[PDB]
Amino acid sequence: TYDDHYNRHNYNPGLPALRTWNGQKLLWLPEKSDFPLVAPPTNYGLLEQ
Amino acid sequence: MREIVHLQAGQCGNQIGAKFWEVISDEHGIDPTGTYHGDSDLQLERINVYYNEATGGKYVPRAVLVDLEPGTMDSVRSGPFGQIFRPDNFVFGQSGAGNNWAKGHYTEGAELVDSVLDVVRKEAESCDCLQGFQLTHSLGGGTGSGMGTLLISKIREEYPDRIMNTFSVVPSPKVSDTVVEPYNATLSVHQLVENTDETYCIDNEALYDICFRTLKLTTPTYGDLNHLVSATMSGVTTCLRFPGQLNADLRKLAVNMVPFPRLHFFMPGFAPLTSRGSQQYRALTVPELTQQMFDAKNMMAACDPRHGRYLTVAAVFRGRMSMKEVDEQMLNVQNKNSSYFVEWIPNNVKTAVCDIPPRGLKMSATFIGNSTAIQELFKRISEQFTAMFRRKAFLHWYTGEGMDEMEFTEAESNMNDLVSEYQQYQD
Amino acid sequence: LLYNWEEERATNQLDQIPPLQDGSESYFFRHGHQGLLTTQPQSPMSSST
Amino acid sequence: RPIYSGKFFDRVPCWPSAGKVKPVGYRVATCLTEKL
Amino acid sequence: MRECISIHVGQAGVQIGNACWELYCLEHGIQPDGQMPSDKTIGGGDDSFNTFFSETGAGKHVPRAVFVDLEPTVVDEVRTGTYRQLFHPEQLITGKEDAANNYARGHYTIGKEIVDLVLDRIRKLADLCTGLQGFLIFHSFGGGTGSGFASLLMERLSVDYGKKSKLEFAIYPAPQVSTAVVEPYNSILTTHTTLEHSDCAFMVDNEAIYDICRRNLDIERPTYTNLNRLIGQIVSSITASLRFDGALNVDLTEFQTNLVPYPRIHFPLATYAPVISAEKAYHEQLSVAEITNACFEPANQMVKCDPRHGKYMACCMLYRGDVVPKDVNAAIATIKTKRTIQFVDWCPTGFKVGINYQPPTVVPGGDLAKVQRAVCMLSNTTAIAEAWARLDHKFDLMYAKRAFVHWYVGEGMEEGEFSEAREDLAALEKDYEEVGVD
Ligand SMILES: Nc1nc2c(ncn2[C@@H]2O[C@H](COP(=O)(O)OP(=O)(O)OP(=O)(O)O)[C@@H](O)[C@H]2O)c(=O)[nH]1
Ligand SMILES: Nc1nc2c(ncn2[C@@H]2O[C@H](COP(=O)(O)OP(=O)(O)OP(=O)(O)O)[C@@H](O)[C@H]2O)c(=O)[nH]1
Numbered sequence: 001t002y003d004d005h006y007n008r009h010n011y012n013p014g015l016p017a018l019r020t021w022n023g024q025k026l027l028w029l030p031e032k033s034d035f036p037l038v039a040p041p042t043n044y045g046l047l048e049q
Numbered sequence: 050m051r052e053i054v055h056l057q058a059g060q061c062g063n064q065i066g067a068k069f070w071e072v073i074s075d076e077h078g079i080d081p082t083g084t085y086h087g088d089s090d091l092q093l094e095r096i097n098v099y100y101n102e103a104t105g106g107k108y109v110p111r112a113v114l115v116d117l118e119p120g121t122m123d124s125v126r127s128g129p130f131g132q133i134f135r136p137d138n139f140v141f142g143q144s145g146a147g148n149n150w151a152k153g154h155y156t157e158g159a160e161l162v163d164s165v166l167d168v169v170r171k172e173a174e175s176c177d178c179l180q181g182f183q184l185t186h187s188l189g190g191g192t193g194s195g196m197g198t199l200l201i202s203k204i205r206e207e208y209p210d211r212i213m214n215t216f217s218v219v220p221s222p223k224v225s226d227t228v229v230e231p232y233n234a235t236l237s238v239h240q241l242v243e244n245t246d247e248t249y250c251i252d253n254e255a256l257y258d259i260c261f262r263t264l265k266l267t268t269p270t271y272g273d274l275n276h277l278v279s280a281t282m283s284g285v286t287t288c289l290r291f292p293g294q295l296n297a298d299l300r301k302l303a304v305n306m307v308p309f310p311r312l313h314f315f316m317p318g319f320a321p322l323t324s325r326g327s328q329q330y331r332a333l334t335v336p337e338l339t340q341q342m343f344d345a346k347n348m349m350a351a352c353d354p355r356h357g358r359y360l361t362v363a364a365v366f367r368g369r370m371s372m373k374e375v376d377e378q379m380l381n382v383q384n385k386n387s388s389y390f391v392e393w394i395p396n397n398v399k400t401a402v403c404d405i406p407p408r409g410l411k412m413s414a415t416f417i418g419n420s421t422a423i424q425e426l427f428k429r430i431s432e433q434f435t436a437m438f439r440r441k442a443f444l445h446w447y448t449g450e451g452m453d454e455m456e457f458t459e460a461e462s463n464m465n466d467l468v469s470e471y472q473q474y475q476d
Numbered sequence: 477l478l479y480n481w482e483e484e485r486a487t488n489q490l491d492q493i494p495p496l497q498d499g500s501e502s503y504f505f506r507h508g509h510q511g512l513l514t515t516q517p518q519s520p521m522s523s524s525t
Numbered sequence: 526r527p528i529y530s531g532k533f534f535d536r537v538p539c540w541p542s543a544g545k546v547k548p549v550g551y552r553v554a555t556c557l558t559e560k561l
Numbered sequence: 562m563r564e565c566i567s568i569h570v571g572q573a574g575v576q577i578g579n580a581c582w583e584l585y586c587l588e589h590g591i592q593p594d595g596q597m598p599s600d601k602t603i604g605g606g607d608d609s610f611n612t613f614f615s616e617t618g619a620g621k622h623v624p625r626a627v628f629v630d631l632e633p634t635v636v637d638e639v640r641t642g643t644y645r646q647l648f649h650p651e652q653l654i655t656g657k658e659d660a661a662n663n664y665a666r667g668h669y670t671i672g673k674e675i676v677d678l679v680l681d682r683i684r685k686l687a688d689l690c691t692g693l694q695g696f697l698i699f700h701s702f703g704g705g706t707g708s709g710f711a712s713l714l715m716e717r718l719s720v721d722y723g724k725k726s727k728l729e730f731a732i733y734p735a736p737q738v739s740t741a742v743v744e745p746y747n748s749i750l751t752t753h754t755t756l757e758h759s760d761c762a763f764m765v766d767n768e769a770i771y772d773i774c775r776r777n778l779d780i781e782r783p784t785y786t787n788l789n790r791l792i793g794q795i796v797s798s799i800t801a802s803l804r805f806d807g808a809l810n811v812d813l814t815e816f817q818t819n820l821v822p823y824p825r826i827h828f829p830l831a832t833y834a835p836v837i838s839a840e841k842a843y844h845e846q847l848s849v850a851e852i853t854n855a856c857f858e859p860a861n862q863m864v865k866c867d868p869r870h871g872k873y874m875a876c877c878m879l880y881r882g883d884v885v886p887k888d889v890n891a892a893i894a895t896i897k898t899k900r901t902i903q904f905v906d907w908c909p910t911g912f913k914v915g916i917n918y919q920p921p922t923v924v925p926g927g928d929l930a931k932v933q934r935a936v937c938m939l940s941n942t943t944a945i946a947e948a949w950a951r952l953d954h955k956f957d958l959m960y961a962k963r964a965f966v967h968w969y970v971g972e973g974m975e976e977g978e979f980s981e982a983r984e985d986l987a988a989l990e991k992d993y994e995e996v997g998v999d
Contacts, residue, residue, distance in 0.1 A: 021126055023607035024562040024691050026119050027136070030604055050479070060809075094477055119562070120810055145694070147814040223894055225910050228819050228875065257887060266550040268529065268885045271808060273552055328559050409557055433909055442907060445824060527933075530883050530918040532806075536590070540923075543842040544933035 004036050011036040051298075052098050052176045053289070054169070055112035055183050056200070059193015060121040061218060062185035063114070067125045068275030069185065070110055072283050073099070074130060076408055083107040083133050091405065095290040101175060109135060111176065113168050117142040117157060117192055140165050146192045150233045151450040153195025162199055170207075180289075180299055181212020189220035189230050194237035201244040212299045213244065216282065218251040219351060222429055229443050231433045238427075239460035241313070242467065247303060248313045250423075251278060255349045262346055263322035277349075281317050284415030288365055293404030295365065305399040306361045306419055311470055314423050316350030318342065318364065318416025333412050335374040342416055343382060350418070357421030358475055359390050363399035368412035375400055391421075391475060421475040427464055434461055490515055563803050563812070564612040565728075566686055567626035567697035570714070571707030572635045573732070574699040575628050579639055580789035582624050584797055585613055586644070587924055588804070595621035595647050612803045615689070622647060625690075626697070627682055629714075631656030631671065631706040654679055660706045664747035665974045667709025675710075676717055683718065695726030695760070695813055697796070702734050703744040708751050719758045726813050729755070729762035730796070736865045736951055738768060743965060745955055746979075753982035756989070761817050761827045763939075765792065769863040778928060779838045787928055794921065794929065795833055798881050798937045807917035808886070811879075819913050820875045820941060825992060829875065829941035832862050835932045842930040849880075849888045849934065853896060856938040864948070871944020872997060873904040877913040882920035882934040889914070905943075906999055913939075946993035953986055 004010060014032075022029040057066040077092045079085045085106050087093060100108035110133060116122050122139060125131055142161050146153060173179070182204065186193035201213065217237075220230060227233070241248065256274045260266065264273070288297035306315065321341055323331060331337070342364060345353050366375060379398050390397060407413050438457060488494065495504035526549045569578035589610055590597065602608055603620050614622035624647060630636045636655045639645060656675065660667035687693065698715070701707040718727065734748055755762070770788055774780040780787065802811050821827045834856035835847060855861055856878070859868050880889065893912055896902065904911060920933045960979065970976075 021123075021136070023611060024605075026123065030607075033605065097478060118810075120806060124806070145812055145814050147812075147818050149818060221890070224890070224897070224912055226912065226914055228908065228910050228913065230910070253886075257890065260887070264555060266552070266555065268547065268550075268887060270552065271886070276553065276556070323555070325555070436909065437907070440907065442822065443818075446818065527883065529885075533883075533918055533920075535922070541931075542933065543847070543931040545846055545848075546933075 003041065008036065008039065050097065051178055051180050052111070053180055053183065053286075054172055054176065055099070055110075055185070056169070056197075057112055057114055058184060058186040058196050058200075059190035060116065060118065061187045061190055062193055062216075063116065063121045063125055064271065064275055065185040065216070065218075065278065066112065067128055067130070068272055069279040069282060070112070070133075071130050072276070072279040073286075074133070076283070079108065079133075081129055081132070091292060092290075098290055099286075101172075107133070109133070110138075111172050113138040113140060113165065113172070115140045115161070115165055115196060117144055117146045117153070138168070140168055146195075148191030148227055148229075149446060149450075150191060150195045150236045151447050151452055153192045154198055154236070155450060158196060158199045161196075162203065165200065166203060166207075169204075173208075179208075179211050181214060183212075183214035183216060185216050187220070188217040188234060188237045188241070189225065189227070190217075191227070191233060193217075194233050198237055198240045202240065205244050212303070213246045214299065215241070215245045215247060216249045216251075217241075218253065218278075219426070221252065221254045223254065231430055231437065232443070232447070234430055235434065235457065235460045235464070239463050242311065242463065245313050246307075247299065248315065249282075250314055250316055250350050250426075252349075252351050255351070259322065259349050263324055265324050277319075281319055281415060284319070284367060284413070285365065285417070287367055287403055287405065287407075288401055291403055291405035293402055295401030295403050297401065302363065302399070302401075302417075306363055306417065308360070308394070309474070311467060312360070312419060314419070316348075316354075316418040316420065316422070318418055319347065319349065320367075320414035320416075321410070321412075322347055335370070335378060338412060338414060339378045339382070342414060351426050352422055354418070354420035354422035356425065359397065360419045360421060360475070361394075361397045361399065362416070362418060364414055364416035365401040365403060366414040367403040368406045368414075369404060370402055370412070372402065375402065393474075421471065424468065424471055427468060431461075431464070431468065562611065562692040563694065564625065564690055564692050565694050565697055565803070565813075566683075566690070567699065568711075568714075569626060569628045569699045570630070570711040571701065571704045572630055572632055573701050573704060574707055575630055575635060575639070576785060577789040577792060578626060578628060578699055579642075579644070580786075581793040581796055582626065583644065584790065584793045584924060585624075586622075586647075588797075588922060589614070589622070591622055591647075593643055593646070609804055613800075623649065625686070627652050627654065627679065627686075629654040629675075629679060629710070631667070631675075631710065632659055633657065652682060654682070656706075660709055662705040662741055662743045662747065663969060663972065664709035664712070664750045665969060666972060667704075667706045668713050669709075669974075670972065672710050672713045676714060679714065680717065693725065695728055698727060698729045700729065700731045702731055702748045702751055703741060704731075704747070704751075705741075707731075708747040712751055712754050715755065715758060726817055727760045728813060729759050731762065731764060733764040733766050733864060733948070735766060735768055736948065742959075745952070745959065746965070746969070748952070749956070749982045749986060750978070752989075753978075753985040756825055756985065759827060761813075761821065761829075763831050764828060765831065765863050766865060769865065773836055773861075773863070777837050777841070779841075780928065783928075790924065790927065790929070791833075791836070795831060795937065798833065798879055798921065798935065799939075801881055801917050801919055801921075802879070802915060805917055805919040807880075807915070807919070809914070809916055811913070811915040815913070816877065816939070820877060820939065822874050822941070823996065825989065826941070826996075828945060829877075829939050830862055830864055830866070830945070832856055832938040832940075834861070834936050834938065835930060835934070836861075837930045839928070839930055842932075847932070847934055849884055849892050852934070852936060853878075853892050856936060857896065857902065864945070866942065866944040866947065868942055868944055869901070869903070870947065871903075871942040873902065873911065873940060873942045874908055875911045875913070875939075875941050877915070877937075877939035879915040879917070879937040879939070880934065881917045881936065882932065883918055884916065884934050886916075889916075943993060943997045946990055946997075949986055949990055949993075953983075953990075956983070 019028045019031040021027060055066070057063060077096060078088050085093070085108065096108055099111060101111055103109050114122060114134065119141070122141065126134065126139070140161065142157050144157055184197055186197045188194055204213070225231070253274065256277060259277070260269050288295055306312070321331070321333070321338055341347055345355060348354070379400070383396070441454065491509065493504070495501055527546045528549060567578065569575050597603065603616055606615055606617055610616055610622050614624055616622040628636060628648070633655045636653055640650070640653060654675070656671065658671055660671070696718070698711065700711045704711070715727065734744060739745070767788070770791060771783065774783045774787065820829055834852035921935050923929055923931055
């Protein structure tokens, strides 16, 4: 989680204004319940050395 | 200064206003995004009467959207100008309507009147000093009549010193679609007659007849009807927002149309209606405008006042006119049908001259009428109630909600009083 | 025309130092403006005693 | 011209439909006046 | 939001429910797997399916209907079918024993230990739902298991949930065709139980469906495939308001308010006008006028009633497709001018219009036409009492000599309930007569 929010600067392929009047809750919603999962998670330099 | 705050109620008033604000915005020339394109000094001048200021030159519409059903508002927010409309102003209920008057007037309203009152006073405190309020809804509307009747009652004690403009469409006389619709009429118009000071009466059948006559386009949209009525409401509001030697304040007008308190129902009148060839076949001249202004066919409100007489006449003119063609034209019509006015009052004309023409046509006008032609209207419904109250159709719903036929007894009694009242004044 | 119209429209032409960045008028006019004097720049040289 | 509905979505337009699509006139051009 | 839950009871009521969902997945483009193409439609479950399907994070559209049956043959067969992967296995409630067409057997013997199971399903569906306007109940009077089992269910859902709607749909017993002579007994056993609890029951008859097939659809040898497709189109049309929009949008709450005149009777008639073969649609014309004439033509109604022998109270037309008020409002005005149509003077207006710009689509491998203007006619008339009048005379004969009674009493029931129900019909028929008296 720290890597995502702080280091990875969160999810790139996401659309920025993915939050607006929705369906059931006819308001700003479809922003984030999915959360990033992609990209090398465990690839700092100390492992290879 | 003196400003106006609007309320949109009922799912019709959802479609009514949405055409009506876009009419205002395009006339003032604001883009769909909201960044005003500065072209006219005077429209930048008196925009404050209806719009407040946001950051970056965006003028917020000072109106509040109230409903119960999502889809109707879902369209308007997804509509062309929903972005300029405020989600803060989108108050709604988490329930369906059922097109039942009591549910919206006693059941659903109770938990929503608190929110809307807190809302409307917030914009009331935001602005300084109103002329009053105006409402787009329907008397034959289920949720529109149910909510408005509650709100008009509550707004009376809150601010009894302003203008209670009401814009309601009368359903089609031949068929009302809704079968319990007349019951809604009684429940609405009974309470309307006390709380309101102004009421506009609109009928769709005439709008259909107008389409056959001058539109001649066979298949219109209801939005076209929204566009037509918006032009009518816009014209009377052009008075306030635009310069020219015309006295525009609604009370400056209301005292001029209302001789006695019970006169709340008024009929509109509009200016040149044209067909496909007539645009280049018409010499835009003061007589033919006024001739077309006073045409029983150009009537659009409820029915033909030929069966009755005229109480007051008031037409406001928009274009580059002078004080004398309006002067002579009234004499011509005054001499034309002098007898069809009432001998109670002579010279009942109330004219205002707006020198700022519209965008698309130059020479225009609007007329508001109070004639002796409303009798047949409530007469028509009167036989319905005397019929359908003879054996109490559809009663178990409302009575289950807590309705009693005693309420119906006074509501009809009040209207039959108005039946004689409108009758006695002229007859 | 809003509240306080006439001078606000008229002052911008006499006040010919408008900032370009948004909201920087206070930053620009933090030192102040020219209010306590005539619009003309110079009334010296008056050897009038 | 069936343009009378713009919010509708069909899927297969290759397969022909039926119906006698009425011609379309004007909606707000009447409100406008005489281009050129 | 705007959503409902459907229930399908008995082997009779399940194949039609499959067709409806099969029809429903066509206009929603649902592949048999359970996921859309690479096009983006999935999320928190928010699009046209959200009122019908539940395409959650698993990406699989979950239909909002429960299939309940007591005999595993058919339900396991569809569990081997094409769309079974979408269908939830224990939402496909099956049984191991029959009711032998005995209403009480399906009402007392076995339903007790099965209703608790479905009640868990109902509540576990209830928690995830938001708007939940009501229920879509498919059943049959001549239900070997449809009659008894659903009746107790309808009671239990009534007692716990009495603030929402319950929409009943069943095949009405054929006036002159009887697949069972125990079918008559359970029929009033259902009516007398359901009169004081059912919200809105909409009926239909198979013979007239066949009569349509070789009249205008021109099929002398159809099957349930067409039979279930046609009725599946009917419910699709009324549910298009939930799916799509139009000039005005209507909900079942408005249907229940404006259709039923008075308590007890909630039994209108349904009809779809543009029922016509394919080749006919090619070189012929559809417009509001003739279809209004057709829908009000007496032989186009699917229940054996003569409107000239009755009188109308309400009429609901759901114009699904591209129409305008002008011709519609003019045509209905001409309809009001007609003298043959004997509406009760009690109603000056009885017409409920629902406009929906969506026109119905064709189904691949289908037999319908290519419609642009479609309408569903919902109406209630007094010409229906003859059906109950046709009922009672077969019953008073059968009950006068106590046929099959040893069977029903052998499993623990008695005659008082049978005695009780007969005056209910007697109460029902005079009610029909008295309201017929203006
Ligand atoms: N929006 C809209 N309303 C229409 C149209 N034609 C007639 N109406 C009437 O306008 C009335 C006002 O709508 P609302 O007051 O918002 O309706 P409601 O309170 O939600 O309940 P109902 O009146 O039963 O629909 C409705 O009752 C309709 O009968 C139309 O084309 N568009
Ligand atoms: N709903 C429906 N009914 C059908 C179909 N085909 C025939 N029928 C009729 O529906 C009736 C079936 O009712 P029942 O036999 O009582 O069905 P059940 O109560 O669910 O249980 P079973 O006794 O096992 O069939 C028969 O009498 C047929 O006349 C069909 O596809 N769907």
